[PDB]
Amino acid sequence: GPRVVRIVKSESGYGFNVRGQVSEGGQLRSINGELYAPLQHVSAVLPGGAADRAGVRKGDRILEVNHVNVEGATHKQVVDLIRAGEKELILTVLSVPPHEADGSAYTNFDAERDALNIETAIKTKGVDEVTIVNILTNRSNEQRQDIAFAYQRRTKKELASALKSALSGHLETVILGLLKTPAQYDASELKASMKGLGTDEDSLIEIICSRTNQELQEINRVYKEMYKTDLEKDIISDTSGDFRKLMVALAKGRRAEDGSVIDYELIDQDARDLYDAGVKRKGTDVPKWISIMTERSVPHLQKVFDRYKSYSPYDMLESIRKEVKGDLENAFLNLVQCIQNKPLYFADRLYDSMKGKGTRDKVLIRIMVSRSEVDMLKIRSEFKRKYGKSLYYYIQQDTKGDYQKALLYLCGGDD
Ligand SMILES: [Ca+2]
Ligand SMILES: [Ca+2]
Ligand SMILES: [Ca+2]
Ligand SMILES: [Ca+2]
Ligand SMILES: [Ca+2]
């Protein structure tokens, strides 16, 4: 029932998101025994974050922000009210049952309603991009698949094809990317990175180095289904040298899973081997580096890299810059960052995509589309702590229009 919660403000943000009612015209009913006016709800909570430690739970409906009634206010109004707190955020929330918050309340009627409103926006004179963005950036990827299916049923046209002709520019890129499943999107981004004469090494490295075993297994399956060739064969065709060997190894998605016991002796031996193979000698034993950094689990390699500082005068990143160059150096640097702190890795990539002249939209869009909402909260925390202002703020300065609005929705809030 109506419960009050106080959340401390910090340079890590509040660690939670609010969004509008997904089941706008249907499943909006009495929450936890009492019917109410339309309210925003907590769509995601960062575990261990300030909202989680204060008692905020996924699905909680928001009633008051700092003592002010927010019933019926727009998403931008609540974000402004939450931002208007000098040192604290006080909320009046309402818990909902778990099945009313895990996604299973989304029905085929909601999917058909979303598809109807998207068809309306497409057919509206001049195209209603605002409505299309409002829906698709505030649905889960699974719900977007239901919307696409329902859209095809009612129009006998594919939603992706219809939106491709209705939209243009970077907004088209965002929307079409959101419509694919995670494995489909990564597989098509990988295919695009190897299309044409050159190779987009930056994109190939970013995807291959940052995806987990489970994500890569599904990417390998879907890539084969979509393009009738194995991802590994396309990588082998497009790359060469040690850079090829590293990419092929990582793409297999067969890294050791996190074990139950910390292997301290192997941590020390891997550190020695990394030092003996690089800084300690003339040249580099690249195969030794590749085998250790592709095969060992992420928590193991985190401890290996710290133990490495006991043997080497330079840390792992600086050793890489001193030992290798080119695509191989770029790949190792990205991989070590992903191992050491993946949310910080994406925060730095986002900052790099916007910090200078113009925007590296290809990188900015891919990160905002591909990251889960909770992972984006991890990224927003690292970003705000490192750079002083929010990811929201930098997106605001570098992009404009409906394209900006789509990215800010994917960001999910200000910090
Ligand atoms: Ca328009
Ligand atoms: Ca177009
Ligand atoms: Ca090529
Ligand atoms: Ca050396
Ligand atoms: Ca810029």
Is 64 strand, coil or helix?
strand
Q: How far lies 159's CA from each of 163, 213, 225, 326, 351, in Å?
A: 6, 31, 20, 41, 32
Domain definitions of the chain by residue range: 3-100, 108-179, 182-252, 264-342, 343-411
Ligand positioned closest to the Cα atom of 363: 5
Give alpha helix (H) positions in 228-285.
231-238, 241-251, 264-276
Ligand positioned closest to the Cα atom of 284: 4
CA of 353 to the centre of ligand 3 (A): 23
Distance, in Å, from the CA atom of 292 to the CA atom of 295, rounded to the nearest integer, reads 6
CA of 354 to the centre of ligand 5 (A): 4
CA of 356 to the centre of ligand 5 (A): 4
Q: Which two tokens stand for residue 141?
A: 């990827």
Q: Which residues pair with 45 in a beta bridge?
A: 16
Distance, in Å, from the CA atom of 93 to the CA atom of 312, rounded to the nearest integer, reads 52
Range 343-411 has CATH code 1.10.220.10 = yes
CA of 166 to the centre of ligand 2 (A): 6
- The total of other beta-carbon atoms located within 10 Å of residue 336's CB is 21
Q: How far lies 240's CA from each of 12, 199, 237, 341, in Å?
A: 42, 11, 8, 28
Chain centroid to CA 141: 12
Neighbouring residues of 49: CB distance < 8 A, sequence distance ≥ 6: 12, 13, 14, 15, 16, 377, 381
For 105-126, the DSSP string reads T--HHHHHHHHHHHHHHHHSTT
CA of 169 to the centre of ligand 2 (A): 7
Distance, in Å, from the CA atom of 290 to the CA atom of 108, rounded to the nearest integer, reads 48
Domains 3-100 and 108-179 share a fold: no
Strands 88-94 and 16-19, bridge-based pairing:
unpaired
Q: What is the residue type of 229? A: T
Q: Which two tokens stand for residue 209?
A: 């180095």
CA of 10 to the centre of ligand 5 (A): 26
Give the chain's end-to-end CA distance (angstroms, integer). Answer: 28
Could you give the angle at which helices 326-340 and 286-295 cross, rounded to 10 degrees?
Answer: 30
Phi–psi pair at 85, nearest 5 degrees: -130, 115
CATH class for the region spanning 108-179:
mainly alpha
CATH number of 264-342: 1.10.220.10
CATH number of 182-252: 1.10.220.10
CA of 191 to the centre of ligand 4 (A): 34
Ligand positioned closest to the Cα atom of 122: 1
CA of 46 to the centre of ligand 3 (A): 39
Ligand positioned closest to the Cα atom of 236: 3
Neighbouring residues of 235: CB distance < 8 A, sequence distance ≥ 6: 194, 204, 244, 247, 248, 251
- The total of other beta-carbon atoms located within 10 Å of residue 30's CB is 8
66-101: string of b/e by CB count within 10 Å (b at 16+)? Answer: eeeebeebebeebbebbbeeeeebebbbbbbeeebb
The superfamily (CATH) of domain 3-100 is PDZ domain (2.30.42.10)
